[PDB]
Design a protein around this ligand. Structure first.
Ligand SMILES: CC1=C([O-])/C(=C\[NH+]=C(/Cc2cccc(Br)c2)C(=O)O)C(COP(=O)(O)O)=CN1
Ligand SMILES: CC1=C([O-])/C(=C\[NH+]=C(/Cc2cccc(Br)c2)C(=O)O)C(COP(=O)(O)O)=CN1
Ligand SMILES: *Cc1c(COP(=O)(O)O)cnc(C)c1O
Ligand SMILES: *Cc1c(COP(=O)(O)O)cnc(C)c1O
Ligand SMILES: [Cl-]
Ligand SMILES: [Cl-]
Ligand SMILES: [Cl-]
Ligand SMILES: [K+]
Ligand SMILES: [K+]
Ligand SMILES: [K+]
Ligand SMILES: [K+]
Lengths: 456, 456, 456, 456
């Protein structure tokens, strides 16, 4: 209905190139049919992740010239701190070099073994850090989130009856915290409504339960709220973002997503004692409370980017660029998760590869075939990424078996999207040629980053 | 492909203001309805010129960090010198801060007063430096080049009969040189064939006449040759460039055009004694022969960009992006100069606004309307820019009353082109509503730069 | 020459300023009398640490423009990898965001709880990661390293008899590894001889014991070998470095020291299995095996800086600039650790404050006093940094109770060193006025980074 | 005997080669014993000029990432405009790519055939543009300026009697303007007093005569005023600069000197009519009035740097670093121009090599020897640069036969100065071994840059 032009100009460029199909085939076999193991120079359009692949602005790069590299008390730390305090409203901030650094801190601090962490689906590293510290993870997202072809708004919402049932069955004091993610990545980058955030806050508060947001794509989320939730039409993105976090006790953020940077994240909290504990731990893994495993210039760039993300036209274009790709795939009949989310289009590999069972890793193989036929790199987001259940030793078997076409922010154009859509539409015409995979090498956790496979 | 995807990704972005229509209207009126008085900060898409507005590459910006700022013997100078010798095949090079710096040097070195300089049309600064040093300019472009709507290939070609005629009516000894421009800006960015460059070289050499290229858009020109001149389909852009200059005795270059930089130019020649004399003169106006009024980093950026310009996919996309805008305008019935040239689309503001007389400044108001409706700045290239006749006091009346949509290299997308086209097309549907202008402040010189207007 | 000029020019600058004494006193109080808690903007000359505070080169800032920010397979990773393979000679490399990220990995991978890690003294984070994974740390440095005034060469050498005794008493199978640090920071930056490294490799290999170097100041170390170990005087820094690591099974390194960067580190090993295991773990804490919690641009800068550090004139100047500062203090009677080490001058606070006992934290108070009187920040390196013995709950009581005047690489001049020395000399004249401190806030590990104190 | 520490620390370094003496001799030979022909890569300490060789700040480099490269109405133009209007107090500013571009403009604008332009000595390019436009030059500096060893304050002052004399003999209507330079370069960097600027303005104003400054080293000049002129002890650098230009009708500025940039200049004036004419001409030679042959980023850097220059500690250190080298040379008995100027030390090569006559080029040979012995490049500033008087074909015979040790701003340390001094002193102690030179290649004009020599 609307695909706006880029609300910015190109200031500098990076060359892209395609290698022949025959070379891509060798590369893909070299990589054990795992797109995560391919090499950057062999990729033409790199949709592996929107993590840390974003284009910075001229103002960010100006800040990159103004790094105060002091070991302690860098002025760039104070700019970051004031910016996050202003925009998110949390009392305290601890920088980390990226998101999983903050998850490591939060999980060590806030989980006793045997407690439960509940959330609206999960991100791989987030769940791993919860479980590594002794938590049992419980999925409390609404059922609709797991239905790929279901086109409803705010699919990321928590089901308050699931949360209430967990409380009734396990007791509030045995829930370490709720991890509320905005947006919800596995559902396709699906937003959570303000009404749901408020409802979750009221119920958890009544039971003394803490709520930490996974804030990684919170600006994308705020845009969906402005666009679709009644009563927010006229509120600014910044106001919506500030209200969202008013319903939380803290957050983990990978700045490498919505803060428009190549590195960076942080942990926020309102509680003073937790803040003191977090500082005692940040020095073990990351660095000082005033740099957290980041150079000063990166704290600067992250401060500037988070503020830039609040510009309405930027985030509207960001999200509608993704929608353009998904709209084009859907109009051609390629099966995708719906509605399109904020950061990626998720192909529905279960439908794309109906000739394979999920045990033959259709998402992983489709990702491989897309690179072979198009030079586009995408991510597996199904049974491989979901990992092994620690308790049963068997695959987690998510209902969503998808391939993620993940869009870095401010990097590509609509013409690049057309390339991506065309090549996937042409692969769809011979989708029965996609072969099942088996493991030849499986890491003990987060296996999808470096596992190797062979064709069945 | 008609319209290829960009053969690069965005490395960094330039922040723009997405100023709405009501505010653009206020800004346009405060500019005296003169786009030259607009502030850059208030412009979304700036098509005033392709000069010095290009986006550099990551490699060029790496070069910007390696500026050897020494007054003499800079490594960056030696890199520029080697690059230009390699790619253009001239013996000697003298850097200048931009094209008209080299034009100053060439016209002082190579023109004895009274001599003739003949070229395929002309450019403002180039002709001015010729005439300033006593030359008489003669236009030897083919008659077709002055027919704005005639769509023929290699429209910038010289008419060899005109050059022969000049030689017989004036004598070769009285011709300082032939100024062969590639492309021809005033015809709309029209290319010159290799066959024509060969023919021109042959005739002149037979009479001892020198040929200096105005080379500012030589790479665009090279693309047209690869695309459309029989025999060159399989030659690389570099091979075409090197052959082109092999038919010249030297050149003046604005790096600000096809060397993909924001400042920079140079003078090349093969003659040892002209070179000695250029090195004396460059000290007067520009700088040392080893930096030419450029920072070392800029010599570096220009060395790198000129070589990046040789990449086929880059220049193909550069030219086809301009063609896309022009094609889209032409399909909607918008009157343009044809065929579309390499760097810009020229709107025929006379036909656009037939209901206005030339004295009511149709090009100038159309330009103003374009900004109001889209945030796009465009250049009046008609009666206002032609200046006033001071002997008679009436306007100089240009044959071409145009608005120039000049496209910087690697800055904009096809979606920006759609903003431009869509907005001009809507203005075309209501062309009768475009109001004439009248002066309210007219300076005596450079009136295009600071004049102010009110609607009649 | 005893004090060579800088083997480089200044490319860009950062202003320095001093706030008045009365304001510094307030700042010192607000900081709990812990220099680690002061803010950068309040520091005149910041000698807190040489960690990450280095000035990068033009070549490094060129690489900073060439960040390939791909999530997997960045070109910058492969540059780092081949640079470290070339210069250190290890088979495999895993990037980490800095040194303690590498330490986390090594200690988790190579320690069975109950085993011993033996080393020539220790760095705080290194030992903490050893202990938190269940090792007992054993100091096997030669006795002389603990004798502040004893001016002998290669104070950092392991005592082979101490190592053999540990083997005899505890069994080789109960030794997780030997952590051999080059230089040895706590002894004052004291080098290890190539003969010692050889002897250690011969003994350990016969017992099946692995040796991992803490390579963080290995280039400083190499310089001392070149300067003072007979038969190396005309070998290149690079040769020496490569031979040093030929005696190791791997290493941890903080690039923020001798790789001349503001962020960055890595883990190296020769063993194939351990490498596979390291990659399974890097994704939990840091990131992919091909970015390790760094931006692409940072792997690039680190690759470039490590190679720059091999330049003899650079490392000669670096080390002799520290010596200059130590020579000036010593000549004026200020007590220092001797001989001066590679990266810092260590004030002997035991002799500076003979009126205080070590239980009164003379080093912590001397660092506070230096800042208040001069605006120079320096680090406690005594009883506070030594930490708390977790078994008995008592302070570790190091013989060395020192203050570290830590020199960032390529940042300051000899004139700055003169200012530092003059201010400390003047303080020493009223040394009796320095008051003892006591804890008011003690973190549970690594307490020196954020502890707060008050005067006794 | 105050030599302050640098009021900045090193943010980034420039890589340098330090080739040994035997290779420097080889290079010096290949260069024809002319230091202007040496390559930058072969020089350790490059004191050829303070022009465009300065180190910029982090703030300037952040400005470099904020280049608004628009052809008209760039934010960087507006920032430069308001900054110069503010700090110099002129009504109108026209940017130019460097000083001699502005001189071209001023001389074309303000000189009528046959008029006189009188100044306190002259600079090469400034006087050339004056004469080229029909002016007759007249030196009205005080006679003292020409006496090298005369150590008096404000040596650049104009002699009011000579000005009154010129007026009486020639008539004020035949004087185009007084060209007053601050500092006076050819006298050795000698300052002009506020008293003299005031008196010059008074006398000229009495006769309706214009005064235009050469402002290139106006900040250095302001420092001398602050340090030494009674009435200005308590005035800031900025207040002094602003008062200085209040005694002028306009100025030409090379930003490559006291604006702390690598490229840039401008033309200032108060007269509305001359401004309009200057805007007409700037288009011919430089660019639009809105960029003047500069990239937007450079207008930015120059705007930032002019303001930085006003910082007392910066300019105090700048001047006292030059003074340090001069004082060390004079204490060793090396003959120099006195007092030491703002930007350079001038060796008196006449006395240094009193065994040679001027016609044997003692300054040129000394410069050669300085480089061979230290890797310092310096500028011949004597008979060779004076040039031939080609009316007669003989050498011009300046009273000042000098070698200029020209100090770029913020690039070097006092340790570098010691390198320079130590080597020159060693040379001085066997100054008889310096061999005379003779032309083997002389150009007709500007022989300083390309002439080549051999030992007699
Ligand atoms: C063919 C050709 C050129 O195209 C060219 C640059 N073209 C301009 C600049 C420009 C010049 C005057 C007024 C305006 Br309005 C705008 C443009 O905007 O099209 C030059 C000069 O080169 P230079 O600008 O580097 O000195 C020489 N020959
Ligand atoms: C007083 C004063 C100057 O000193 C000056 C430049 N001064 C140089 C450069 C320089 C070096 C060698 C030959 C030449 Br010829 C020139 C120097 O080394 O001292 C200029 C021109 O400014 P510009 O260089 O920006 O055009 C105007 N006035
Ligand atoms: C990417 C991500 C993370 C982890 O962030 P990193 O910076 O990659 O460690 C956590 N949660 C979500 C929802 C993410 O997308
Ligand atoms: C600085 C240091 C470390 C830790 O590295 P970080 O990058 O600070 O985490 C480890 N060992 C030694 C000897 C060090 O000096
Ligand atoms: Cl992922
Ligand atoms: Cl000149
Ligand atoms: Cl420390
Ligand atoms: K520009
Ligand atoms: K740092
Ligand atoms: K990245
Ligand atoms: K320069």
């Amino acid at each position: 209905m609307n695909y706006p032009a880029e609300p910015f100009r190109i200031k500098s460029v990076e060359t892209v190139s395609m290698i022949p199909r025959d070379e891509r085939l060798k590369k893909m076999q070299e990589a054990g049919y795992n797109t995560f193991l391919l090499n950057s120079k062999d990729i033409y359009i790199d949709l592996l992740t929107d993590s840390g692949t974003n284009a910075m602005s001229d103002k960010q790069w100006a800040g990159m010239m103004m790094g105060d590299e002091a070991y302690a008390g860098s002025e760039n730390f104070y700019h970051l701190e004031r910016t996050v305090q202003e925009l998110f409203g949390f009392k305290h901030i601890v920088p980390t070099h990226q998101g999983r650094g903050a998850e490591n801190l939060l999980s060590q601090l806030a989980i006793k073994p045997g407690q439960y962490v509940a959330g609206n689906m999960y991100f791989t590293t987030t769940r791993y850090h919860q479980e590594k510290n002794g938590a049992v993870f419980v999925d409390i997202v609404r059922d609709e989130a797991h239905d790929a072809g279901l086109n409803i708004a705010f699919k990321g919402d928590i089901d308050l009856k699931k949360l209430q049932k967990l409380i009734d069955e396990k007791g509030a004091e045995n829930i370490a915290y709720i991890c509320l993610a905005v947006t919800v990545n596995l559902a396709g980058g699906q937003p959570v409504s303000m009404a749901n955030m408020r409802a979750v806050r009221e119920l958890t508060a009544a039971h003394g339960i803490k709520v930490f947001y996974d804030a990684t794509r919170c600006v994308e989320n705020a845009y969906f709220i402005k666009e679709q939730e009644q009563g927010f039409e006229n509120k600014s993105i910044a106001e919506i973002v500030h209200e969202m976090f008013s319903y939380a006790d803290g957050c983990t953020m990978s700045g490498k997503k919505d803060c428009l940077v190549n590195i960076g994240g942080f942990l926020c909290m309102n509680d003073d004692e937790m803040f003191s504990s977090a500082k005692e731990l940040v020095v073990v893994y990351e660095g000082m409370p005033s740099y957290g495993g980041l150079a000063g210039r990166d704290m600067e760039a992250m401060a500037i980017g988070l503020r830039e993300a609040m510009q309405y036209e930027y985030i509207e274009h960001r999200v509608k660029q993704v929608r353009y790709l998904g709209d084009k795939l859907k109009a051609a009949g390629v099966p995708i998760v719906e509605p399109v989310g904020g950061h990626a289009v998720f192909l529905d590999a279960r439908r794309f590869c109906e000739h394979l069972t999920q045990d033959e890793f259709p998402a992983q193989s489709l990702a491989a075939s897309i690179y072979v036929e198009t030079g586009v790199r995408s991510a597996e987001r199904g049974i491989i990424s979901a990992g092994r259940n620690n308790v049963t030793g068997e695959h987690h078997r998510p209902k969503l078996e998808t391939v993620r076409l993940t869009i870095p922010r401010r990097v590509y154009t609509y013409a690049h999207m057309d390339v991506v859509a065309d090549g996937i539409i042409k692969l769809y015409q011979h989708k029965e040629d996609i072969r099942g995979l088996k493991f030849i090498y499986e890491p003990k956790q987060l296996r999808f980053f470096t596992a190797r496979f062979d064709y069945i």
